[PDB]
Design an enzyme around this catalytic site. Structure first.
Site, PDB file in Angstrom:
ATOM      1  N   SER A 125       0.808  -1.246   0.000  1.00 33.92           N
ATOM      2  CA  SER A 125       0.000   0.000   0.000  1.00 33.92           C
ATOM      3  C   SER A 125       0.835   1.287   0.000  1.00 33.92           C
ATOM      4  O   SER A 125       0.233   2.342  -0.187  1.00 33.92           O
ATOM      5  CB  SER A 125      -0.971   0.021   1.122  1.00 33.92           C
ATOM      6  OG  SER A 125      -1.948  -0.958   0.884  1.00 33.92           O
TER       7      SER A 125
ATOM      8  N   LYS B 287       0.138   3.678  -2.849  1.00 29.56           N
ATOM      9  CA  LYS B 287      -1.030   4.604  -2.858  1.00 29.56           C
ATOM     10  C   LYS B 287      -0.537   6.041  -2.913  1.00 29.56           C
ATOM     11  O   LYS B 287      -1.243   6.907  -3.468  1.00 29.56           O
ATOM     12  CB  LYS B 287      -1.935   4.335  -1.661  1.00 29.56           C
ATOM     13  CG  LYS B 287      -2.688   3.013  -1.750  1.00 29.56           C
ATOM     14  CD  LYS B 287      -3.430   2.656  -0.500  1.00 29.56           C
ATOM     15  CE  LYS B 287      -4.123   1.329  -0.675  1.00 29.56           C
ATOM     16  NZ  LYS B 287      -4.905   0.967   0.509  1.00 29.56           N
TER      17      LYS B 287
ATOM     18  N   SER C 296      -6.022   3.421   4.147  1.00 30.31           N
ATOM     19  CA  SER C 296      -5.507   2.347   3.252  1.00 30.31           C
ATOM     20  C   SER C 296      -6.699   1.579   2.645  1.00 30.31           C
ATOM     21  O   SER C 296      -6.704   0.325   2.533  1.00 30.31           O
ATOM     22  CB  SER C 296      -4.472   1.442   3.917  1.00 30.31           C
ATOM     23  OG  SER C 296      -3.462   1.048   2.945  1.00 30.31           O
TER      24      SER C 296
ATOM     25  N   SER D 141       1.192  -3.366   3.936  1.00 26.95           N
ATOM     26  CA  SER D 141       1.295  -4.715   4.465  1.00 26.95           C
ATOM     27  C   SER D 141       0.831  -5.676   3.382  1.00 26.95           C
ATOM     28  O   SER D 141      -0.028  -5.336   2.568  1.00 26.95           O
ATOM     29  CB  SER D 141       0.433  -4.872   5.718  1.00 26.95           C
ATOM     30  OG  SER D 141      -0.889  -4.418   5.489  1.00 26.95           O
TER      31      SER D 141
END
Ligand code: K
Length: 263
Positions: free
Chosen positions: A45, A48, A105, A212
């Site tokens: 992530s 992002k 997230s 993660s």
């Protein structure tokens, strides 16, 4: 050469049984501290940030882009979507999707940002446009988190991601308004207190994005404002040999503490 900081990071890495990648840029003097800085790691992530920044760059030539509604359908929900699921059969704006992706997230929100850029290769195109030749996004969420050892998909190097994050948040890759928006979003992150932030003095202020994935992959990328110092950029990437391995945010914190002590 191997510095005292690199020696301490190697010792931390040994006790962990995983693989650790660190990149520090200190904007006081533009000096860098790297551990496995040119090895590839799964971004999970932390990607992002590139997707939200690419939409912010599009918003520089479209005043109302961030207010643009995006439909959310039941079929759009994936593994983790705590904001998008409230807007099913409704809309979220690109500003709302950016905030949900970076601060919560939300993976449905990241997939809308990717879709707005024309797919994963649109995020990679933006990276190349701002001088990042290393970053690659290949897949949508959640399959970009498979984090398989040796897989080049959805990877970068610590060195590349620290330079990019610096350009985005402190440099001029974005316009002034957009850079400020990205920093506000990162500072408002809800998921980062156990990672880089946990290794730093409380008085320092942090904006970060975690990630993660499989193989116990535990990542954080941060812009740090130390009390009485010029800002730092810090990347900490960690990945483990076994697909089912547990998260190790404490290793990122331990890496951040070694880095801070080394200033
Ligand atoms: K995991």
């Amino acid at each position: 050469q191997t510095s005292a900081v690199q020696q301490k990071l190697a010792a931390l890495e040994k006790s962990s049984g995983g693989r650790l990648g660190v990149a520090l840029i200190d904007t006081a003097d533009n000096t860098q501290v790297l551990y496995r800085g040119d090895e590839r790691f799964p971004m999970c992530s932390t990607s992002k940030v590139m997707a939200a920044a690419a939409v912010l760059k599009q918003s520089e030539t479209q005043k109302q882009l961030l207010n643009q509604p995006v439909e959310i359908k039941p079929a759009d929900l994936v593994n983790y979507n705590p904001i998008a699921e409230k807007h099913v059969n409704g809309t979220m704006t690109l500003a709302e999707l950016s905030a949900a992706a970076l601060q919560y997230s939300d993976n449905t929100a990241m997939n809308k940002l990717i879709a707005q850029l024309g797919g994963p290769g649109g995020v990679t195109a933006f990276a190349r446009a701002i001088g990042d030749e290393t970053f690659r996004l290949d897949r949508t969420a959640p399959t970009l988190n498979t984090a398989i050892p040796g897989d080049p998909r959805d990877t970068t190097t610590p060195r590349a991601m620290a330079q990019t994050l610096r350009q985005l948040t402190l440099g001029h890759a974005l316009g002034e308004t957009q850079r400020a928006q990205l920093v506000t979003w990162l500072k408002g992150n809800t998921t980062g207190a156990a990672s880089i932030r946990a290794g730093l003095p409380t008085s320092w202020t942090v904006g970060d994005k975690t990630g993660s994935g499989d193989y116990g992959t535990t990542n954080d990328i941060a812009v740090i404002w130390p009390q009485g110092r010029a800002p730092l950029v810090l990347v900490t990437y960690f990945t483990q040999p076994q697909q089912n391995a547990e998260s190790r945010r404490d290793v990122l914190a331990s890496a951040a503490r070694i880095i801070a002590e080394g200033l």
